[PDB]
């Protein structure tokens, strides 16, 4: 149905998902002059010590590394969050060229890619009930710039050949998401939504100030994936990002001075 092409991309999404023109849509541009530091924020807790990855897959839009969320094994607490959010999966958004690929921007500056770690409020039982509530999801966003290779990313990059096209999957165990984080946990936060259809407005966004560096070679592996299924016309999985949306009446809060 939907995608990132000319006839099924971000400018067509409102037709099937009218909430695309809603009040708390993501992504957004982050204006550092108006993104005020918020002294009420508590420190963010990233607890990935017992994360249990299950698999990696191509869903026709991106690749998703899935995790066992049946217990508190990889969770996010603190920050602006009320309670505990379990990591269910992570995936990236990237461009054709280094010059673009991120969803969020900082003072209009676009990064080569953006990692998203998706988490759901255990108040709700499972992902399914959680995605429909305003306080239902917590996505940790992390920008990627091009430079030194990211060692923790290599395990992912080395299995992408196995999931080239939509519908493919493969066993993917013992992957450690702590290996994808930058040094600082400095972040901006605002109430948003899923950047992909159904675009439900149920996500508390936490975007880290410090990008990670990944090598031109790792990102180049990303680019060889396809949006299409085996046997269909070969469509390179590139530019799977939605551009910035109006901030509207929202405020972006900084965890740092
Ligand atoms: Zn995403």
UniProtKB/Swiss-Prot annotation:
Coiled coil stretches, renumbered: none
Q: What is the effect of changing residue 59 to T?
A: Reduced activity
What is the name listed in the Swiss-Prot or TrEMBL entry for this protein? Answer: Carbonic anhydrase 2
Query: Which residues are annotated as active site?
Result: 61 (proton donor/acceptor)
Q: Which consequence is recorded for altering residue 61 to G?
A: Impaired activity, not rescued by 4-methylimidazole (4-MI)
Q: How does it assemble?
A: Interacts with SLC4A4. Interaction with SLC4A7 regulates SLC4A7 transporter activity. Interacts with SLC26A6 isoform 4 (via C-terminus cytoplasmic domain).
- Occurrences of domain Alpha-carbonic anhydrase (ranges): 1-256
The entry's cellular-component GO terms read:
apical part of cell; cytoplasm; cytosol; extracellular exosome; myelin sheath; plasma membrane
Q: How is the cofactor bound?
A: Zinc. Can also use cobalt(II) with lower efficiency, but not copper(II), nickel(II) and manganese(II).
Catalytic activity from the UniProt record: hydrogencarbonate + H(+) = CO2 + H2O; urea = cyanamide + H2O
Family the UniProt entry places it in: Belongs to the alpha-carbonic anhydrase family.
Q: What is the effect of changing residue 118 to A/G/I/L/S?
A: Reduced CO(2) hydrase and p-nitrophenyl acetate esterase activities
Q: Which gene encodes it?
A: CA2
